[PDB]
Write an enzyme that holds these catalytic residues in place. Structure first.
Site, PDB file in Angstrom:
ATOM      1  N   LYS A   1       0.945  -1.119   0.052  1.00  0.00           N
ATOM      2  CA  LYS A   1       0.528   0.081  -0.227  1.00  0.00           C
ATOM      3  C   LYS A   1       0.663   1.360   0.082  1.00  0.00           C
ATOM      4  O   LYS A   1       0.896   2.296  -0.773  1.00  0.00           O
ATOM      5  CB  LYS A   1      -0.983   0.098   1.258  1.00  0.00           C
ATOM      6  N   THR A   2       2.316   1.378   0.603  1.00  0.00           N
ATOM      7  CA  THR A   2       3.050   2.763   1.589  1.00  0.00           C
ATOM      8  C   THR A   2       3.438   2.850   0.008  1.00  0.00           C
ATOM      9  O   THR A   2       3.384   3.664  -0.626  1.00  0.00           O
ATOM     10  CB  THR A   2       3.765   2.520   1.890  1.00  0.00           C
TER      11      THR A   2
ATOM     12  N   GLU B   1      -4.271   5.829   1.445  1.00  0.00           N
ATOM     13  CA  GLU B   1      -4.236   3.845   1.356  1.00  0.00           C
ATOM     14  C   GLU B   1      -5.754   3.682   1.907  1.00  0.00           C
ATOM     15  O   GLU B   1      -5.862   4.630   3.150  1.00  0.00           O
ATOM     16  CB  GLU B   1      -3.035   3.072   2.194  1.00  0.00           C
TER      17      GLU B   1
END
Lengths: 305, 305, 305, 305
Positions: free
Chosen positions: B112-113, B156
């Site tokens: 996600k990051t 996110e």
């Protein structure tokens, strides 16, 4: 995605959705077995109509809308599946339209229909010509104008429908919470209750929850609603209340009390406390919207039933 | 509702949300124990700041935002509970900001990051200076301009976060579906999987789902996504693939294949196939959005790690 | 500015403007000597009515609107000037309504009125329920709904009107340029010509100019119009033409030729080449807007006179 | 109309206009004799670039923009004229940008340039990163973000420019009215004066005129301005005034008085009463826009010169 294609566009639940999408500026095509005034109206408004279900009818569509269930026997559906063109059911497309308008979602297992009609009648009295949905069908007072023209879209929210939790209203009414539709939720009434909380949480932080505290289940979940709330009912502690309920012939009269307003006398053509409560929900929505006392009175008293 | 009050407005994940609400035109107030440069910047942009907690600081607030749970020892929170002012947790207010912008939700248990950062980097190179949310902190590159100024909000989306199903993005990514957070769904991976489907169905019918088909769980649920979908991965059957992965030092090169475009040679400054995949996801969103090849190359190549 | 005060709100040209401003969400108040159904309707829609003229009626107003029939001795206007509150004539407020809507400005010394009516009739056939302005009076078909609700405002543009050059339309028609109103421009026809050029330059660069090239003066200024232009008329070099003009009773039939379209038989209920030309201007606007051939045929033929 | 083509797109006043149109979502093409870093940046942002002039370069364009006069000999210009495709001068397209933004038009024969810079500086300090126009060249503080990204466009308005009366601003400033450009108006100062009245009347009734009443010609036309007006100057009757003017090094200090506010001490890094007045004009706009005292103080103090 810019071209929406209806399989069975003449079908009652379908034509009204296509019309709104036309009003929003999309390209709409549709297929149907028979041509009718409903297909010619849509055509006059810009829809491309095909008679018969040939696979080529779906060519160019970015999304398909089907009436009942996904039928791969229909070559229009099959052709879209074969090309990963999404096929959404009618009920989800109906729900999406509220994302383009100031949506008023009227939930509650009983009182949905009358309350939607009372809201619509009062908003129409204020000159706002709303589009409204009862029983899956879109309507408006004005008959030559296109559905969706109003800024307002008023719709009943059925907690047994699979798109219940995909509504995006600005305002949401809960008239009551009953166990009729437990089976949708694994036959468990506590899950049904939690779904109502989830529904109310799809409101934005600037939205409005309109809640009948006369319903003990509504009163139970109120502290869980982290949204602006206005309560209504006969209960002494409701924000908006009816007192001095009386009858003149076949019509019901009462006085509505509201925060920071003078008491207002009102009448409706139908009997029973439930229609008194449906008027209070309506009076709450209209008051918050800025509609005048004269339009409220006019809309409530003129509703036939 | 139009004035939001933050309890602890100087906190790390609170100040960004206050700044975006300021940028959206709302009235913002907040309280904190210590005056700070954070609170000074907010004051310069129009927030009303109170030092110390006192029940009067909440006066006139339409909604309160609190940093975690509802510490109802705090006088402001208690004063709001008494006055029926909704008290919204930090993460809900953060999630709701996406309704005001062209939102891109980067979901997936892992990746996600880096994927969110890659997206922001490419959009930034395209002149779009997006606001992006990592670890609950809102950021952007040009640092005098208020957060939220961009049309774009890239965030996110964590499936263990209670706001997961309340995001309203225009574009959703799913990098992978792992069982890290089965506890949130009663320790049941099938429940987890169905939630990713429900998540993607918050897209509108004109939105876009971006799916890594290299993940077998993402590949399993693909047929249930009734929304426009582009798939990416190293799989030969993915819409957007990477081929001829090579290395030169600490930097990975590869060729990206896209429907209806010529092969594009790209590098990224991070090792491993997973960062090739996060780049594929970014290339998919950027291409759909219309961003030039040049900004894609520069966005991907200049990202440090 | 958010509160507009009409001095004589019930007058024939004032009540429509106030209703549109209400539809736009402004605060509207107004005075008059006599209460009427017109004053009741505006009140029901949210206007504050004062009966009788008195200085404090104007208190709180950000702008006053006056018609020709308002004296400078009127207390309300006198008090407004004393406080530097702007006082704008009815015609200017009328011309600025186009700033909120997709404005179709129907200019040209003769034929403004029929052409405006024809546009409204065709647009209504396509379900667009336009508001339109004839002789300074606003109207629409849907009688219960507020003026201004439609996306479209179709208005007569009069070169003898002081507000002629403040109209901000999206499309502008010039039916013909005659010398009737030389006196508004120093009694000089060439200045009047220049005025028409400046009027058309109020269009945005993405706007549309619809020009009758059967008029020799319209044809003469055509190379000065640095905007997109579609020409119409009987002239063989016009973009949109009428051919095979014929009669069948009180009805006139003709074939309209359009770029990139098949020829369309059309009929109108009015005699003479000028009403053929007014229909061609209508067809040009309608075609450009995307309206169906069926709505064009039905709006044109169903118009009475 | 959706594609704009720039003849000489790398030119000094042209590339910024192209960039803003890119940010508005339009298709932009451009021709030039030599590729540059300017054309490369525009290419990175979405613009199709053509090296050298050829009649095909204008293929598909709905409007062309040219650097000075309509060159006629230029093959792209000649091609466009033959197809009746409008050719607008650079200055006209530049003035059109204001219809898309919150436009602040800084007029006045003298002081335009410093006043525009001061407005940009204060707005930037308030985190709003305006795009501003000085000497026909567009700029903004943040350099990777596309021009036009701000909600605000601040431009000087020159009354010797053919587009002076085609600006559509939200706020208009008149610093002063001099006879420098009488020639533009037939060497008549009274016509020049009347042009400033007409300019201010291109504001909507919700706009704002900001007028230096220290200028006697500005004070003369003031009663003719039928729009909301705030006056400024040293005059004791100005709405917004400077008092207590003093010096501390190269820095001018003074106190600003505002309706319904407490006096505010400010300083500027430029000498002379005229820069006190340009600061006063900047303070009127910033105050009316809601920018805080901190940003006002910081924007004015930190401006070099």
């Amino acid at each position: 995605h810019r071209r929406i294609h209806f399989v069975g566009i003449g079908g009652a639940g379908m034509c009204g959705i296509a019309e709104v999408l036309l009003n929003l500026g999309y390209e709409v095509s549709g297929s149907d077995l028979k041509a009718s005034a409903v297909t010619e109206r849509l055509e006059k408004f810009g829809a491309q109509i095909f008679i018969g279900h040939q696979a080529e009818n779906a060519d160019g569509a970015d999304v398909l809308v089907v009436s009942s269930a996904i039928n791969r026997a229909n070559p229009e559906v099959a052709s879209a599946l074969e090309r990963r063109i999404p096929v959404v059911p009618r009920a989800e497309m109906l729900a999406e339209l509220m994302r383009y308008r100031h949506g008023i979602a009227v939930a509650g297992t009983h009182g949905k229909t009358t309350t939607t009609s009372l809201i619509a009648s009062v908003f129409a009295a204020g000159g706002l010509d709303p589009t409204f949905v009862i029983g899956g069908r879109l309507n408006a007072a004005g008959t030559n104008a296109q559905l969706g023209a109003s800024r307002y879209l008023v719709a009943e929210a059925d907690e047994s429908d699979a798109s219940f939790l995909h509504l995006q209203p600005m305002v949401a009414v809960v008239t009551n919470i009953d166990a009729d539709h437990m089976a949708t939720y694994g036959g468990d009434f506590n899950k049904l209750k939690k779904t109502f909380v989830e529904f109310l949480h799809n409101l934005p932080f600037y939205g409005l929850a309109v809640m009948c505290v006369d319903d003990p289940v509504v009163r139970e979940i109120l502290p869980q609603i982290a949204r602006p709330t206005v309560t209504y009912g006969l209960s002494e502690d409701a924000d908006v209340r009816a007192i001095n309920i009386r009858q003149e012939g076949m019509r019901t009269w009462f006085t509505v009390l509201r925060p920071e307003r003078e008491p207002l006398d009102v009448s409706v053509n139908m009997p029973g406390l439930h229609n008194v409560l449906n008027s209070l929900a309506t009076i709450v929505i209209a008051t918050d919207e800025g509609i005048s006392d004269e339009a409220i009175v006019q809309g409530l008293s003129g509703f036939q039933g």
